[PDB]
Structures are given as structure tokens and as C-alpha cells.
Symmetry: D2
Subunit: 157 residues, 4 copies
Amino acid sequence: MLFESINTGCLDGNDTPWMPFAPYSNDVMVKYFKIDPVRGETITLLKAPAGMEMPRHHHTGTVIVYTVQGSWRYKEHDWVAHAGSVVYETASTRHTPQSAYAEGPDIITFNIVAGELLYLDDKDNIIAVENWKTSMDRYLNYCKAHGIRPKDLSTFE
Amino acid sequence: MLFESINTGCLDGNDTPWMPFAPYSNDVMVKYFKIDPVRGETITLLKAPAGMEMPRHHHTGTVIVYTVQGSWRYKEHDWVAHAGSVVYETASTRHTPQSAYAEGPDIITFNIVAGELLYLDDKDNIIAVENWKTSMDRYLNYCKAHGIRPKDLSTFE
Amino acid sequence: MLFESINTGCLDGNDTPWMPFAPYSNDVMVKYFKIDPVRGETITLLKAPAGMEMPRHHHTGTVIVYTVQGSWRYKEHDWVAHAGSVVYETASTRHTPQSAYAEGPDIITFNIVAGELLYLDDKDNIIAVENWKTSMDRYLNYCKAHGIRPKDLSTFE
Amino acid sequence: MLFESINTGCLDGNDTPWMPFAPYSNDVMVKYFKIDPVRGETITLLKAPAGMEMPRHHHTGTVIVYTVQGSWRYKEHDWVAHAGSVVYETASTRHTPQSAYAEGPDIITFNIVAGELLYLDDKDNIIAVENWKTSMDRYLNYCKAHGIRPKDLSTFE
């Protein structure tokens, strides 16, 4: 019976490792806090160095982004998200995230992503897909590669 | 200011038309009740004749299915959903819906779909995508084709 | 590890019992399909005889109501929900549901309720609260009272 | 037609004011980023000075808390949330938030609260309720009190 085990949890910053966004990039780091397989939701911190244009992605659900530090923007919009701002991406929209400056502080963002991230080509083809399964595979692959007993980010406990 | 206009609404069965799932099928009918563009959620009735195997789809979010009448199942699972049952599909999973019998009552289902439906080939390629945008395009295209003043399924009012 | 057990499930109409909405009413019946303790969501069928005014309730989240049969309405609104209609109640609103006629078919409704139902007095005081915990208590109390092995409505499997 | 206006938005830290959590406290500050009246969801930054025990509250939905700075905890749990941690509160649970130390850095937290916050007495009575309506009233009352043209936190645009 699952409800007997469900309760308010807390995962401290240094109880989940920072890890490279493999096999695509070694500079973009990610830290997984929650990976909900029922609704397909992930809660993460995402570190990225300055002056980096990232791939255009089509996202199926919503994305809440709180900028911890640094500045960034989408090539498709005329605004810049600074530290202390909140960006709310809506369903079935396309975005090309990138750094707001060629050099400066690294971009750290707290993200709550619902649904899958479908990465695209210039010719508009779907090349890669990131979801809770790919998030979990990466989290468990890094843990098993190192000597880290992995935590259950799937449950709410 | 949007909250001033937000309130509990009601769309009666004969205030939204039954329409073919164009341009793919003329036999599978759909009725749109809500098309949320923020979270990418649609509420619909979906009519389908007996003995029809539908395309395999990968779904990015959740799907709550209440069977109004008829019986159906997924080729990937060993159970059959009858009238009065509730099926709860979870994020990033693949399913091939089909009729539970070659002949009998038409399958009517009340569906609450969160996210996009990525239709696939036997070779596993993404061929078609259904989302709130494609749902809205179809709803507005049928209304404009006929003499129907379309309703705002985007707002909650 | 929870994600290893998460999958698309199906609960048939006669695999969850119809039960009175105890200890408040013996005429209003409820059937529980899902009782999510993480987000506080319940999926149910709710049967009610004609000509019955129910208590006014304040609801904290949303409610999607599909009318399977019968007709009903809220005293606070000028519309009537008939069979085949969809009603979408929005957050922090107050409603007094009641039958659209003094005599006629029993009202059966498919409901997806997110959050708690705070029942109120004429003097506007909170008297009763219905949530996933009270839903689960009732489901498990009826099952234990009878000889029914209860199902895990808490998990998505 | 609402979907025509829906798009990815961004509210910068200094485009929404820090304001006291009136009429209850002048020391606890709040900053509103989003106030969704459909699902009853609010996105906020919440500043609180060290060594402050806050009222016990029962919450109807979920709460995602990212600690920007400082340390805090719930009296009902044995863990402490530090800067860089993520706390996920689940539906229909009771918590007494408080500072992890009598003196030290002020507690700043990024919160995503779904549903209402029902504040309680020692005798367990519901005394106060905070929701999107009370959040909006406070946001609009402070703006009108000062010479601030208020932003539409209700829409996703």
C-alpha cells in the first residue's frame, strides 16, 4: 500500500551529485532532485558556462525556471532572464536557450520540467528526446559508474 | 486581468460538435470540451467503430480514460477496459489501442490527455504528433468549414 | 525503486465496490478508482438520487465532472449539466450541487477532484473536510467491514 | 480566444515588489511571480528572518521548496533544509516551519504552492486560509497603496 510510505521529503544539495549531461555535453552539468515517472516531471539544478548556445528544443508540457545565478535568454524572445527571475514556458512551444553574454558568471538554474524535451535540427527533425526515463538512466548510470548508492528519486517520501 | 474572468464553466454535449479525426480518419470521431494551451491538456469524447486497430503512439504526459461504452485494450497489456472502467496511462509509455472485439458496440471514451501524442511507425519513427495546437486547429477548421461560431475552449470560464 | 513498478493500469467497474458516502449519507453512493496521496487527487463515480440538495462546499483545487446520466446544477450558476456534458470547477470557489429535477433518473457523475472539499454551514463555518485521506479511510473501512481484499488505489500500476 | 495570447513569459526579480505578509506579519516578506486562479497555484520568493517559529498549517495540495539561502526545518520532521536543497511537501499534511538557528542568515525560499494553506490553532481549529485569492488581494492592495501599475500574474503570457 503506497500511501502508508508517502510523506514530505528533503534532498540536500550534497546528497545528489552534480553530473555531466552525458553523452551530449561534458560542460553542461545537471543535479537531479526528483524524477516523477507517473506524470513525467523532473526537478533539477542545471549549471552551464557562459557564452554557450544550446540546441533548440520543442517541449511537450510546462517548464518553471528560477535563475539562481547568471543571465540567459531564448533566441525566439526579446527578454533576458537574470538571477532572481522566474520564466514560465508553456506547452508545445519551441526554444533555443543561450547565454546572455559571451563571458561572465556561469548560469545556474532551478528547473521544474513537466513532460519531454524533443531536441530539433535546423531542418526541424526530432534528433534527441529527454524525459524522466533518460533522466533516471543518466542518474543511475553515473551512480553505478562511481561508488554511489543511488537514492529513490521516483517516490515522494 | 485574467482572474476577473475565470469561473466554473459547463459545455453541454450538443454545444461542441462531433467531428472526424481529420486528415487521418473519417470513422474515428472526436468531440472537444477543453483545450488548455498553458499545460497542454485536452478533455474529449472519442468515438470509434468496433474491430479497428489504431496507430501505436508514445505519450509524453498522462491520460485518464473513462469508458462510456464498448470494450477496448492495448496490445502491450493483458487486460480489457469495459464500459464503467477507468484506465490511467503514465508518462513516456507506448501503446497500441484497439477494439476488444471484431464486431459489437462502438467504443466511446471520455479522455483527459496531458501532453502530446507522438504517433510511431513499425520501424519506431515519429510520423505524426497530436497536441493542443493540432486539436485547436481541427476544432477551429471544422467550425470555419461549417457555419459554427466556435467557443473558447482555451479559457476556463 | 518505485519507477520499476509504475505502469499503465486499469480498474474495471466491478473490481471496486459502490459504497455509501458514510457517515454523512446512505443514499449518495461513491466508487473509488484512484486515490493519489502525493498530489491529493481522486477519480470516482458518484451516484445520487433525484431531488436532493447537497451541502455547499468550498474546493481548494480543480474538479472535472463528466455527467454519465441524469441532470444537475449548482445553485450559484444559471446552467444545467446534462448527460454527456463536462463541467470544469476552478480553484478556491464555492458551490451547492443539486439535482435539476425533483424526480427522474439518478445522477451518475465521473469526477476527477484535485485537492480537498471543505463543507460549509449557512453561517459560512467549515464543518467537514473530504480529501484523499478520508477517501482512503472510507474505502479501506468498507473493505475491512466486508470480506473484500482492498486494492492499492494509492499507486499507479 | 485565450490561446492566441498564451506564450512563454518572464518576470524579473525587480519587476514585482517585495512586500510584507500583511496583515499577519511585517517581518516575513513575500514576492509574487505567478498567481494561477484556474488550478490555484502560486510561485513566490519568501524572505524570513532567523529564529522565527511560524504558524502550523495544513496544506491541501503540494509544495515544492528550493532554499535560496539560510536553513530551516519542520518541527514534525528530523531533517534540516539548507541552501541548495529541495523539499517536496505532499497533499493534506500538517507542518510547522521554523528557522534552523536562533541567529544567522535570513531564510529566502523559492516556493511553488498548489492549493490552499489552512493555518491552525494549538486546539487544531482552522484560523486563517491563504490561497490565490488572498495572494492576489495582497499583491493588488500593495500595488494600489503605492504608485505601482500591477502586472497580470493571473495569465501565462
